[PDB]
Amino acid sequence: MQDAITAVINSADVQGKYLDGAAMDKLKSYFASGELRVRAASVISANAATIVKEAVAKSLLYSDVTRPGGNMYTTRRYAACIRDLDYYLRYATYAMLAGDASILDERVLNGLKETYNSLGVPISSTVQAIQAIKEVTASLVGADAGKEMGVYLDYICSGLS
Amino acid sequence: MQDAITAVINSADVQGKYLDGAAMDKLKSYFASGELRVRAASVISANAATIVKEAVAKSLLYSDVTRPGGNMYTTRRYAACIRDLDYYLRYATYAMLAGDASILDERVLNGLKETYNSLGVPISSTVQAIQAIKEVTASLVGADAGKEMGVYLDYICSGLS
Amino acid sequence: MQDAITAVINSADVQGKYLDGAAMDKLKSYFASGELRVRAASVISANAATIVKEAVAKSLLYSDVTRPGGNMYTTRRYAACIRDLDYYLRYATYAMLAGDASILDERVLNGLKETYNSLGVPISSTVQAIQAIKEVTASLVGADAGKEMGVYLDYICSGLS
Amino acid sequence: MQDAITAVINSADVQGKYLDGAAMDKLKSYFASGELRVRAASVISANAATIVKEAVAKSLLYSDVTRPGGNMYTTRRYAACIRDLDYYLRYATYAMLAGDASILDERVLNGLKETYNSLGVPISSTVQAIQAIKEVTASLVGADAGKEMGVYLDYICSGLS
Amino acid sequence: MRMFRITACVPSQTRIRTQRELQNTYFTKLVPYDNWFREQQRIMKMGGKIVKVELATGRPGTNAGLA
Amino acid sequence: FGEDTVPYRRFPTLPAANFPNTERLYNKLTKQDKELVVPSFTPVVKVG
Amino acid sequence: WQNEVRRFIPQEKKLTAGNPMNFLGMARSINPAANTIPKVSAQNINIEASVPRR
Amino acid sequence: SIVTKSIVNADAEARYLSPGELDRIKAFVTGGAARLRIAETLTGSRETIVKQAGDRLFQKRPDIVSPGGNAYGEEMTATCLRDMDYYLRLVTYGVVSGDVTPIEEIGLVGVREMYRSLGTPIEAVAQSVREMKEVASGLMSSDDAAEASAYFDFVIGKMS
Amino acid sequence: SIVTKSIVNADAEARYLSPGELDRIKAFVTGGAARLRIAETLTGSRETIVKQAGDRLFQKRPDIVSPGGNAYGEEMTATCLRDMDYYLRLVTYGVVSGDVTPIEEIGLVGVREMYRSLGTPIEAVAQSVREMKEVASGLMSSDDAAEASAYFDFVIGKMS
Amino acid sequence: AADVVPATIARFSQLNAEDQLALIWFAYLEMGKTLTIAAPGAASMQLAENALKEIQAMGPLQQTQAMCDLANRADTPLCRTYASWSPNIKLGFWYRLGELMEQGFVAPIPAGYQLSANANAVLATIQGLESGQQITVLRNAVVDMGFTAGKDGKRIAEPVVPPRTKVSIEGVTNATVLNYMDNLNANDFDTLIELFTSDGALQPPFQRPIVGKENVLRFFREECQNLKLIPERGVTEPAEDGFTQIKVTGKVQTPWFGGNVGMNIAWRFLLNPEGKIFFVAIDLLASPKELLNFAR
Amino acid sequence: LIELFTSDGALQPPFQRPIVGKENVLRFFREECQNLKLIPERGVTEPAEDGFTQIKVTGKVQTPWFGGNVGMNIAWRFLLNPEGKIFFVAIDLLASPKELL
Numbered sequence A, B, C, D: 001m002q003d004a005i006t007a008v009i010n011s012a013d014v015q016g017k018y019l020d021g022a023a024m025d026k027l028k029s030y031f032a033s034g035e036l037r038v039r040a041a042s043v044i045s046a047n048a049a050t051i052v053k054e055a056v057a058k059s060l061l062y063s064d065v066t067r068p069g070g071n072m073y074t075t076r077r078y079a080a081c082i083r084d085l086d087y088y089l090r091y092a093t094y095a096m097l098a099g100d101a102s103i104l105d106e107r108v109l110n111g112l113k114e115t116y117n118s119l120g121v122p123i124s125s126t127v128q129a130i131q132a133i134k135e136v137t138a139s140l141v142g143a144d145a146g147k148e149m150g151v152y153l154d155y156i157c158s159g160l161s
Numbered sequence E: 001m002r003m004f005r006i007t008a009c010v011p012s013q014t015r016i017r018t019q020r021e022l023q024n025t026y027f028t029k030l031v032p033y034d035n036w037f038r039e040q041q042r043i044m045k046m047g048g049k050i051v052k053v054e055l056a057t058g059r060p061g062t063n064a065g066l067a
Numbered sequence F: 001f002g003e004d005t006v007p008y009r010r011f012p013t014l015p016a017a018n019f020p021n022t023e024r025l026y027n028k029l030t031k032q033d034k035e036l037v038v039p040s041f042t043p044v045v046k047v048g
Numbered sequence G: 001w002q003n004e005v006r007r008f009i010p011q012e013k014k015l016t017a018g019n020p021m022n023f024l025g026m027a028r029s030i031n032p033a034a035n036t037i038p039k040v041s042a043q044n045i046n047i048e049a050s051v052p053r054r
Numbered sequence H, I: 001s002i003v004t005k006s007i008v009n010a011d012a013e014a015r016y017l018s019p020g021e022l023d024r025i026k027a028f029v030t031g032g033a034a035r036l037r038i039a040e041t042l043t044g045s046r047e048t049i050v051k052q053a054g055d056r057l058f059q060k061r062p063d064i065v066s067p068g069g070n071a072y073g074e075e076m077t078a079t080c081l082r083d084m085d086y087y088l089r090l091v092t093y094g095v096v097s098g099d100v101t102p103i104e105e106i107g108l109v110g111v112r113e114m115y116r117s118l119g120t121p122i123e124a125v126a127q128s129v130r131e132m133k134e135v136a137s138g139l140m141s142s143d144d145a146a147e148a149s150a151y152f153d154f155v156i157g158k159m160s
Numbered sequence J: 001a002a003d004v005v006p007a008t009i010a011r012f013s014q015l016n017a018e019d020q021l022a023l024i025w026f027a028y029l030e031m032g033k034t035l036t037i038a039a040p041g042a043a044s045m046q047l048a049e050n051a052l053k054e055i056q057a058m059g060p061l062q063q064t065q066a067m068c069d070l071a072n073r074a075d076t077p078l079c080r081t082y083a084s085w086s087p088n089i090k091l092g093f094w095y096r097l098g099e100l101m102e103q104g105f106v107a108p109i110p111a112g113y114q115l116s117a118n119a120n121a122v123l124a125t126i127q128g129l130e131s132g133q134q135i136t137v138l139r140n141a142v143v144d145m146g147f148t149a150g151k152d153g154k155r156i157a158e159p160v161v162p163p164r165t166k167v168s169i170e171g172v173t174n175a176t177v178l179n180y181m182d183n184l185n186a187n188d189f190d191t192l193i194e195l196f197t198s199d200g201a202l203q204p205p206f207q208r209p210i211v212g213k214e215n216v217l218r219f220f221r222e223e224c225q226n227l228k229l230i231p232e233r234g235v236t237e238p239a240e241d242g243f244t245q246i247k248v249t250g251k252v253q254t255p256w257f258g259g260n261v262g263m264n265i266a267w268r269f270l271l272n273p274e275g276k277i278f279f280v281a282i283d284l285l286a287s288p289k290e291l292l293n294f295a296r
Numbered sequence K: 001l002i003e004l005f006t007s008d009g010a011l012q013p014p015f016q017r018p019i020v021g022k023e024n025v026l027r028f029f030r031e032e033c034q035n036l037k038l039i040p041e042r043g044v045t046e047p048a049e050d051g052f053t054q055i056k057v058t059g060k061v062q063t064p065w066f067g068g069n070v071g072m073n074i075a076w077r078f079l080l081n082p083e084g085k086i087f088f089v090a091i092d093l094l095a096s097p098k099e100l101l
């Protein structure tokens, strides 16, 4: 996977040059964002379970998916959704802390479409739950950290779409 | 897989007959090939690392292929290319000593084009690598042995492309 | 495909928001650049017949490509090569006039990479020819217009990579 | 395994009492020694191969063991001895970092004395090889870290006794 | 092929398995020489105590003919 | 599987795509086809 | 009445970072100190004590 | 990068980054000004650092350049200098990133295979990088010399 | 021994030896006289073979014995002569056995690690065994020259 | 002859510690032009730069004492550290000592020393021999050198030899500046602490000026140590308020702030019209040579 | 300006060790010498080893540069390359009786 710093490193090294002024500027910009990234990551780790709980409450509960026959039926499957939302949130936090959403399409989106197609998961329902998580985390962490987290979560949603 | 001898054997067996004159002359031709193939295999086993070394030094080495952007960059990708060449050389020796390309197209062409495309491998650069392999093998094995080795390597190249 | 103005309009439409100060300043920037782009387009339309000629002369004449075995060999292939370069020149001029890369995204690089790979044509030498025509157009048009043309052309090269 | 902190914690927990003044003093001692241990680890990681090579050369090379009929004789047994000394160096460095010999007891000493007894490997020769490693590492790191590194190596030799 | 026989006691340090476990907690196996180092490294890293090991098959110090 | 369990088909959740790859591997009978279900993982970022 | 006689040679491809062409001049400026050809023939060396024994 | 390494460890344990990892990343991002400055310094001293590094390496082991060595002529010595510039660029990458993963990814995986296929003495390569480190430390601030020496030392250990 | 190799294959397959293995052992036992002749010739002409091959290797790679090299010093050139003696005797063992098992077991497994530890250029050693090949072929008969060359080719490829 | 190297080894063997040390020093002197060139990289010097730096930091008297202790295999920590090293490490360490002596970083030999007859004969034999047996003889000689716990002895100890002129300035004959230069060559900074006034304005090369008499005394006690100053000429002019500006150029025959044994050093003195030395600035003039640079 | 510098061109700031490296000298110019005026007065020129041109130029600095505004002398020691590029430039801040620098 690639972060904001190794992204600049590989961008320079593909042409093989050294680190010029633009590379140093990009690294300094990432270092400036690092404070916000670290604070948001710590808060999200602290409130991970509550965030997914609230998103599930406001996006999935009391609907056809949770009703009998629905994909959220069969409590093993409900726990599977809880774990999946936890995975999405944790890897979104990883991507936000890295500054590049390469881990999202490497360790997360890789095979996700075919997985959900085989398992009959409601893709739009999962996407909607992801925006619910995005809104909850944005409210919890603020405007800028919420901005970055929403960027990466919506990248995940676009990958699902 | 199969070689010329097993090819004549199973061609007879599928019709459920003994060895007719055509099979006898085919076997005689393969036996006449014989010691030439075994000598070429022995010399190749002698200078196994050599042919790949000078083939790389001729075609791939000191170029954009081994430069940044080219697929040969980084020691990991370089050694991966060397390992690929060693695979190709051992399969070429096996196919030479057998007399058929069944070993190759059962152990080479199966999914190789698609896997190299997934890795974004340069098919042209690979083909040039096998070519340089061909000349370096010819310069050490002679004229007819080198010619048949080049024929097998050319079949490998055609399957790769 | 959309110009800079239409791209701004579509962005504001997607956000469901009016053209705020950022949109107005971007549109004013495009309006300022309009005179430059129009004059550069007129000049490059003047010299379009010859510009590719000197670009190829300084790029891909009397090299391995032009000779037999080279992918530019034969009148048919050379005409295809010059036509490809003319396509790049005309569509990059289009992109410069529009102030947006979407035209090249959808009408130029869409499928071009795999098309070249299937055709076997030299993508690296195509990149070099595009670079050479970049310097030619830069010298022909000036500094700022040449810089815009160069960013379009090396974006084309990055897509073709 | 254990370190100094875990060793102190277990020593307190076995009688089920809180960390008293002596435990805090030991923890302070380890915390002070941490910088020195880390620097020594950096040096040994620098010179991992060279330390083993010098130790074997001054301890076993051109001696009875390396000659035909010796345990270190033959390429396979030479490689085995080199690997054993490399693992000894690495695990002694691990113990130096941890501040505790538990890693050596439960990762370097259980199943090794009787393994050498089964293989006929010279315990009296491997002891001197470890001592040569101790001398080389002492010369590199210095007397301060070298004393504790030699303490751990002497522990290894005593366990091997 | 110069195999090794080892008795090792491997406790459980993370999970309380409710079914019978002596067969893998206290066992004596025959290990090939090539895999002995890897097996012993794995056992130590898993935390077991190597109670005993002995070269059941093969001869010590064979300079040739060990397969 | 430990030292006493015969290996059995698994249904891992992670890492990514491992579940679909194992599903494609195990849903086909022996010698069903010669294609490669997972020839390799196309890396998102190419070094050099 | 000047005229531009374009030549056989292709236009020289611009040097890149990976190529050691730019290091060629640096290596020449280095001019590393080579080693004289050793005068050893090994015939009068006898392998009973000439090999180290420590 | 250090952030990438921490993310990988957290993913391996299937959990969020611990407070220790977070504080380490915070300290690294705060102190990144010095790392960028030292990368700039090594980039500027690139030409000289390579020059006297190669000179000291050749003096310490002329066999690599002498008849029979890997880089006997000026041409192959130029290639050797090119490789030394590669490794300088990799150490710069490591300094800016803060962690050795770029170094391992670019120039330490399969390096033994590379320098056994090329016949290059890997011990000679290690000595060359070591002289590189010595000259860099000489022309660098002492504490910053240690900061770069961490990555130079890691490359030395991997080469050896 | 090819007999031991065939026994290993048969026991792995859990079957008695096949006609191929029987014919192989029969041919080996019938050619044992010529194999022992080759072994006796190599043993008798060992010192001249090793010395000439070592000098040809010196001419190929003067840097091996140049100052600062692994073979530098009369001690470190006599040790090359000793190593060449060891490998020649190993080739004699392999010739008399008919298979490469003793060679792989005494000089090929762990050899790269040993020479990495000692700093030796295994490529140079491969050139040396090549030169021993030409010298032994010159001193030896033409018909058995191919047979000895097969084992020399094996050793050169493996230790290359 | 086959036994040339063992014969030379025995001949080096009967020689004493003084003979052995003188022979090795002259061998280093003849090295490259007459003896085998040095390629120190082949030896693992990484386990030896610690002792090398320690010996460099040691003072010249203790430097020679440690060297003679190593030569006669005395029981010292440095002797044991040398002995435990491999023979190539020992030879590389001796070569590093020779390089340090040639560059002035370590206390060199007495001026105009001559080899003994036996050592000269053995060195002539070494020069006659080939490079291979040359290096073999050198290695065998150096291996036994250094103390290893065991059965060893030395017939006679080689004791360290127990054993100043006014500096002459062309164009400058100021008593204060002459006393300054002579007492720095003698390391008489205690005398200088009153030789210059209480201002204590010193200008180390590539550094900002030092302020304070205590600061100048600390600088003299720490940095300045056994410096060999050989000024060439000088010029004196009247500065403001009767101050004397004295620009004196010479050379410093000792490593000094990354300075060579021969370096064009220049001292600019603002000396008090009534007092003595108000400010001193030291500048090492550049040339086609720059190793003390630190970039930034 | 720095094109007059040699590729191995070095700068010697006052009170600081020499700086070697083209971009290093660029950095010195663009973060240390920032909008300062100098008043050179006189100079001398002669040859030097390796074909260099040693030029000692004395002038007055009228801008704050490490202290001593206006009343400090700048000594440019120019070891120029034989081609003409400045192989080494040393800027020495000769000081008046003013102290506390």
Ligand SMILES: *[C@H](C)[C@H]1/C(=C/c2[nH]c(/C=C3N=C(/C=C4\NC(=O)C(CC)=C4C)C(C)=C\3CCC(=O)O)c(CCC(=O)O)c2C)NC(=O)[C@@H]1C
Pocket (backbone or CB within 6 Å): B057, B061, B062, B063, B066, B067, B072, B073, B074, B075, B078, H064, H065, H069, H070, H071, H076, H077, H079, H080, H081, H083, H084, H086, H106, H107, H114, H118, H120, H121, H124, H125, H128
């Ligand atoms: C110099 C310190 C040592 C040395 C060097 C040497 N190298 C080569 C040739 C090559 N080296 C590389 C290595 C790399 N390329 C990469 O992209 C990476 C990571 C960025 C590495 C490590 C390669 C690829 C080559 C081949 C040529 C090329 O780069 O295109 C040579 C010459 C080999 C030849 O036969 O030409 C030499 C001499 N040799 C020594 O002895 C020194 C210790």
Ligand SMILES: *[C@H](C)[C@H]1/C(=C/c2[nH]c(/C=C3N=C(/C=C4\NC(=O)C(CC)=C4C)C(C)=C\3CCC(=O)O)c(CCC(=O)O)c2C)NC(=O)[C@@H]1C
Pocket (backbone or CB within 6 Å): B060, B065, B070, B071, B072, B077, B080, B081, B082, B083, B084, B085, B087, B088, B107, B108, B112, B115, B119, B121, B122, B125, B126, B127, B129, F040, F043
């Ligand atoms: C080198 C000759 C050319 C080249 C290729 C290249 N290959 C890889 C990676 C792999 N190559 C293979 C291929 C095979 N493995 C097999 O077992 C067989 C048959 C025996 C084949 C043909 C595979 C499976 C891999 C990936 C797994 C591995 O590393 O072993 C790379 C690296 C790709 C990467 O993304 O890292 C490259 C570059 N490239 C060239 O430029 C040469 C012409």
Ligand SMILES: *[C@H](C)[C@H]1/C(=C/c2[nH]c(/C=C3N=C(/C=C4\NC(=O)C(CC)=C4C)C(C)=C\3CCC(=O)O)c(CCC(=O)O)c2C)NC(=O)[C@@H]1C
Pocket (backbone or CB within 6 Å): C065, C070, C071, C072, C076, C077, C078, C080, C081, C082, C084, C085, C087, C088, C091, C107, C108, C109, C112, C115, C119, C121, C122, C123, C125, C126, C129
């Ligand atoms: C010239 C710089 C290089 C080159 C050219 C070349 N191209 C072809 C063939 C094709 N080129 C294209 C590309 C386009 N067609 C379009 O309409 C556009 C949209 C913007 C593009 C980019 C296509 C589609 C073809 C295939 C059909 C055709 O014949 O035109 C050839 C011939 C290939 C063949 O096999 O006949 C050639 C020679 N060749 C070089 O070597 C130069 C690097």
Ligand SMILES: *[C@H](C)[C@H]1/C(=C/c2[nH]c(/C=C3N=C(/C=C4\NC(=O)C(CC)=C4C)C(C)=C\3CCC(=O)O)c(CCC(=O)O)c2C)NC(=O)[C@@H]1C
Pocket (backbone or CB within 6 Å): D060, D061, D062, D063, D066, D067, D068, D072, D073, D074, D075, D078, I057, I064, I069, I070, I071, I072, I076, I077, I079, I080, I081, I083, I086, I087, I106, I107, I114, I118, I119, I120, I121, I122, I124, I125, I128
């Ligand atoms: C000579 C042309 C090349 C070379 C050789 C060289 N070898 C050594 C030292 C040893 N060689 C061996 C090898 C073996 N021992 C075995 O048991 C076997 C099979 C029976 C082999 C092949 C060993 C073990 C040693 C260590 C010494 C000892 O045996 O006691 C040296 C000496 C290295 C040094 O400096 O000490 C040398 C020079 N080196 C080259 O560079 C040539 C390519």
Ligand SMILES: *[C@H](C)[C@H]1/C(=C/c2[nH]c(/C=C3N=C(/C=C4\NC(=O)C(CC)=C4C)C(C)=C\3CCC(=O)O)c(CCC(=O)O)c2C)NC(=O)[C@@H]1C
Pocket (backbone or CB within 6 Å): D065, D071, D072, D076, D077, D078, D080, D081, D082, D084, D085, D087, D088, D091, D107, D108, D112, D115, D119, D121, D122, D123, D125, D126, D127, D129, E033, E034, E036, E037, E040, E041, E060, E061, E062
């Ligand atoms: C070298 C100093 C001595 C020496 C080495 C030697 N070892 C073996 C074989 C083995 N060594 C081990 C060692 C370990 N296993 C562990 O878990 C640990 C913790 C790090 C250690 C140190 C093992 C498991 C083996 C057996 C498997 C293998 O060979 O890899 C040999 C081979 C003996 C033989 O083949 O008969 C040798 C030669 N020999 C000496 O003489 C030195 C004193």
Ligand SMILES: *[C@H](C)[C@H]1/C(=C/c2[nH]c(/C=C3N=C(/C=C4\NC(=O)C(CC)=C4C)C(C)=C\3CCC(=O)O)c(CCC(=O)O)c2C)NC(=O)[C@@H]1C
Pocket (backbone or CB within 6 Å): E010, E011, E012, E016, E017, E019, E020, E021, E022, E025
């Ligand atoms: C409890 C009252 C006493 C006691 C017990 C104790 N046992 C263990 C660990 C193990 N106990 C067993 C025993 C069995 N496993 C089986 O499957 C069966 C037969 C079906 C038996 C009898 C085993 C195998 C273990 C180790 C492996 C495991 O637990 O799965 C412990 C823990 C020891 C440790 O720290 O590892 C304890 C405490 N201890 C007492 O003090 C009581 C008298």
Ligand SMILES: CC1=C(/C=C/C(C)=C/C=C/C(C)=C/C=C/C=C(C)/C=C/C=C(C)/C=C/C2=C(C)C(=O)CCC2(C)C)C(C)(C)CCC1=O
Pocket (backbone or CB within 6 Å): I067, I068, I069, I072, J018, J021, J022, J024, J025, J026, J027, J028, J036, J037, J038, J039, J040, J041, J042, J043, J064, J067, J088, J089, J090, J091, J092, J094, J095, J097, J098, J107, J108, J109, J110, J113, J135, J138, J160, J161
């Ligand atoms: C090529 C090669 C190498 C080999 C390199 C070699 C050959 C290295 C060998 C170098 C040699 C020969 C070094 C000898 C140095 C002698 C010293 C320091 C003695 C000084 C005596 C003093 C100060 C005493 C002075 C005295 C005092 C004080 C008096 O006042 C009066 C008495 C006396 C005069 C005694 C390496 C090992 C590097 C690597 C491998 C490799 O192949």
